Design an enzyme around this catalytic site. Structure first.
Site, PDB file in Angstrom:
ATOM      1  N   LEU B  83       0.863  -1.180   0.000  1.00 25.79           N
ATOM      2  CA  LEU B  83       0.000   0.000   0.000  1.00 25.79           C
ATOM      3  C   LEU B  83       0.901   1.231   0.000  1.00 25.79           C
ATOM      4  CD1 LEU B  83      -2.750   1.228   0.003  1.00 25.79           C
ATOM      5  CD2 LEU B  83      -2.912   0.864   2.466  1.00 25.79           C
ATOM      6  N   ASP B  84       1.112   1.813  -1.185  1.00 23.28           N
ATOM      7  CA  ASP B  84       2.034   2.925  -1.336  1.00 23.28           C
ATOM      8  C   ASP B  84       1.229   4.175  -1.644  1.00 23.28           C
ATOM      9  OD1 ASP B  84       4.335   4.479  -1.652  1.00 23.28           O
ATOM     10  OD2 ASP B  84       4.620   3.838  -3.733  1.00 23.28           O
ATOM     11  N   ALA B  86      -1.733   4.346  -2.701  1.00 22.38           N
ATOM     12  CA  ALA B  86      -3.126   4.028  -2.398  1.00 22.38           C
ATOM     13  C   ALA B  86      -4.082   4.405  -3.523  1.00 22.38           C
ATOM     14  CB  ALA B  86      -3.582   4.682  -1.086  1.00 22.38           C
TER      15      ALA B  86
END
Ligand SMILES: O=c1[nH]cnc2c1ncn2CCCCP(=O)(O)O
Ligand SMILES: O=c1[nH]cnc2c1ncn2CCCCP(=O)(O)O
Ligand SMILES: [Mg+2]
Ligand SMILES: [Mg+2]
Ligand SMILES: [Mg+2]
Ligand SMILES: [Mg+2]
Ligand SMILES: [Mg+2]
Lengths: 159, 159
Positions: B83-84, B86
């Site tokens: 989850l970067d 998003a």
């Protein structure tokens, strides 16, 4: 009704299988970014067998690259969760060979030789199973029981 | 250049996470064939995290049913490998909520809170990672290094 193969048994077979695939893919010697070795996974049942196998291959020095369904110049190794009628795997092997694979083999986790509609022999087989309906280790009945860590035979009174 | 999370560490986090998801999904109590609990996996990087998580959930009495990409009346739990920004998870959560899910949450394995383009908080997070480029456990760089059993930081001199 009974357990056919536990996760400890399935891993043990994949030890010698990865050792086998390591030997047969030694002279080609392909590494990440260069030639990856395209692991062809056939969704959905083969996602449990794929996540475990690509790591074990890495333990024996065999890098991978996973593609999912349901090219050219690079080696191909199709991975199926179960090999029963072999009709689905037949169409994939033929459709993949069109885009000039530098090699092509098949690796199945569960093989049911007695349920074939056409003659087909996979190069690498994890385990053989008699002609029964089984679930677990990705295998399913109407999108269920994939989470079972072992390959078991389902009770018939659930239909 | 260094190892951030080994497979033994990643599993340990998923023990309490599965214990958490078990508690928050107790009163609904849904079983195979009835309501399965739709595990929404976002290919390709999340296939390693999915195959390990659906089994651990089964160890804590939480049945699953996996769908892959890249409904209605049933609970949804989207699973991402990392989850970067998003942005990719934002589009999936909104597109899934259209087909009336009886519940919706998100479960990510690696969370980079410092790399967000939009505010987004996942309900369950396996581990947090600083703003670096990592591979392993499904994470990749140009379709490679997914087979690494641990989340590590790649050396920059490979570009
Ligand atoms: O033993 C098994 N467990 C789970 N799936 C299996 C097994 N054998 C074959 N399959 C494929 C099912 C799809 C064929 P269809 O019935 O949809 O035509
Ligand atoms: O740390 C990481 N390892 C592997 N993949 C990552 C990581 N952080 C974000 N991603 C997504 C990459 C795609 C975004 P784009 O570069 O194609 O736009
Ligand atoms: Mg494992
Ligand atoms: Mg299949
Ligand atoms: Mg099926
Ligand atoms: Mg991702
Ligand atoms: Mg990527």
């Amino acid at each position: 009704t009974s357990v056919l193969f536990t996760e400890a048994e399935l891993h043990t077979r994949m030890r010698g299988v990865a050792q086998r695939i390591a030997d047969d893919y030694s002279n080609c010697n392909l590494k990440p970014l260069e030639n990856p070795l395209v692991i062809v996974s056939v969704l959905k049942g083969s996602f449990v067998f794929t996540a475990d196998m690509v790591r074990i291959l890495g333990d024996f020095g065999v890098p991978t690259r996973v593609e999912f369904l349901r090219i050219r110049g690079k080696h191909v190794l199709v991975l199926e969760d179960i090999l029963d009628t072999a009709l689905t795997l037949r169409e994939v092997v033929d459709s993949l060979k069109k885009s000039e694979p530098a090699s092509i083999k098949t690796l199945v986790a569960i093989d049911k030789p007695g349920g074939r509609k056409i003659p087909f022999t996979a190069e690498y087989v994890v385990a053989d199973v008699p002609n029964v309906f089984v679930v677990g280790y990705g295998l399913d009945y109407d999108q269920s029981y994939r989470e079972v860590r072992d390959v078991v035979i389902l009770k018939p009174s659930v239909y």
